[PDB]
Amino acid sequence: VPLDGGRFATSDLNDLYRRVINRNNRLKRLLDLAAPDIIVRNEKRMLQEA
Amino acid sequence: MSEAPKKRWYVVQAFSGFEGRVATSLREHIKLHNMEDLFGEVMVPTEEVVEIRGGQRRKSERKFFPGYVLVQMVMNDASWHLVRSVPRVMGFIGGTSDRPAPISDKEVDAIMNRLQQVGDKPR
Amino acid sequence: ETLRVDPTNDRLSALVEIYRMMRPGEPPTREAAESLFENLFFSEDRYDLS
DNA sequence: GTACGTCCGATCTTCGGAAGAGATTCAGAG
DNA sequence: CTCTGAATCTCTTCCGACGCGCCGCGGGACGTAC
RNA sequence: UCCGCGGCGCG
């Protein structure tokens, strides 16, 4: 929903979904580069928490 | 030091956009605390793909993996406290909390021979 | 009996226990424990009674 | 002074009331 | 001494009226170009 | 522009 002015009144669902899909994108972009196992494990845990 | 181990790179995370700032802060902490033997070098991966058009021009700096820096420190308590003391840095990324987890030597070789080819198509 | 239940027997043991209790999950150090304890109830900056 | 891309470190104080799950314990017997 | 074992203590969750009327603030920070 | 938060008030 847009509010009075040049800004937008966003809902929490948009922010949560954006965070989740960004985390998934980073997950995808790290796997193909043979990233260190510790870092991929940590970011997998952080995606799980998200 | 007291032994002859490989002070291999260790994973430390920072806040995005401050990786160079965190590296400089660590370097100046090492300089002022006068404890330089326990530490080696701070290295952050980066890559350079140059494009002559498309908005951003003549340079494009990215990271192999963001929000993580590598430290040449060694297992002890003084260095652990020193790294914890720097701002904008949370706990280590390893196994158990008190003692972090190192990186495999072969995979360290993989990361370093990936790093040595960054100087491809120079000039 | 309050002292009898207590397993600590030295100032170092008490400092280690309080350091581990205040912030769990970190290697305890006697200097670190002393610094943490002195900064909790005996420092003008973070503690000040009116 | 004004668009714009990326992001997400100062560590919480003051209620019963019940219901339920899990850790503890000592009670007692073989 | 040792094994069950039923009872007890401790830790975690969900719950706490229902219709209005009025007013004010709301993604903020933060560096990075331009 | 229809949403959220907070505050005050009436039954």
Side-chain angles (χ1 to χ4, degrees), chain A residues 26 29-30 32-46, chain B residues 11 47 63-66 68 70 93-95 101-104 107 111 114:
Chain A
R26 270 170 59 185
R29 83 172 300 108
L30 292 175
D32 49 351
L33 211 61
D37 54 88
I38 298 102
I39 292 174
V40 309
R41 279 181 185 178
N42 178 83
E43 61 86 20
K44 273 187 184 180
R45 173 190 61 81
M46 182 178 71
Chain B
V11 176
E47 64 274 16
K63 328 289 197 74
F64 283 162
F65 63 91
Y68 293 108
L70 294 174
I93 304 313
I103 313 190
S104 172
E107 178 159 1
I111 203 64
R114 282 207 66 253

Side-chain angles (χ1 to χ4, degrees), chain B residues 49-109:
Chain B
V49 171
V50 287
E51 49 265 12
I52 62 157
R53 209 176 64 84
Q56 175 198 42
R57 205 178 178 180
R58 259 82 177 273
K59 74 93 171 183
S60 74
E61 190 276 331
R62 290 99 69 195
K63 328 289 197 74
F64 283 162
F65 63 91
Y68 293 108
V69 296
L70 294 174
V71 190
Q72 288 292 104
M73 61 79 71
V74 76
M75 291 325 148
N76 66 81
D77 63 358
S79 62
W80 197 92
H81 280 347
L82 202 173
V83 180
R84 185 54 54 77
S85 180
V86 74
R88 310 308 303 272
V89 163
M90 311 75 78
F92 289 168
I93 304 313
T96 187
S97 66
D98 56 354
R99 320 203 315 160
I103 313 190
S104 172
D105 291 331
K106 65 178 72 66
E107 178 159 1
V108 166
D109 291 331

Side-chain angles (χ1 to χ4, degrees), chain A residues 4-19:
Chain A
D4 281 323
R7 301 316 298 248
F8 287 101
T10 183
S11 66
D12 291 331
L13 275 297
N14 292 13
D15 291 331
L16 272 295
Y17 269 49
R18 191 172 60 188
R19 178 176 299 185

Side-chain angles (χ1 to χ4, degrees), chain B residues 27-50:
Chain B
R27 270 174 296 223
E28 61 86 20
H29 280 90
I30 297 169
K31 287 190 285 291
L32 62 83
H33 295 285
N34 214 28
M35 295 298 102
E36 291 87 8
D37 63 358
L38 290 172
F39 274 60
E41 53 269 31
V42 65
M43 192 305 298
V44 61
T46 176
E47 64 274 16
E48 191 36 40
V49 171
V50 287

